[PDB]
Amino acid sequence: MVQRGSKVRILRPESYWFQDVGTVASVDQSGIKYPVIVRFEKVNYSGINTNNFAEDELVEVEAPKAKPKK
């Protein structure tokens, strides 16, 4: 589940930030090309920092917990 704060991988071959984990800034539910907003640290050929992606084009890859079960 992609909430505000969860980091996800980018699966958009068009996005300069392919194969990189960004952070979800906010989720808009009204009708846009990318309901979920993602943030990055690097830039691209256009010189951007934040963009918008769809949840289906993102994978959840947060730092796993170091404690399966005691």
Residue spans of the domains in the chain: they are 1-70
Query: 8: closest CA among 18, 22, 25?
Result: 22
Q: What is the CATH number of domain 1-70?
A: 2.30.30.50
List, in order, residues 6 or more apart from 5 with CB less than 8 Å away.
23, 24
Range list of β-strands (E), 1-70: 7-10, 21-27, 36-39, 50-53, 58-60
Cα angle: 35, vertex 38, 44; to 5 degrees: 120
Cα angle: 23, vertex 26, 31; to 5 degrees: 125
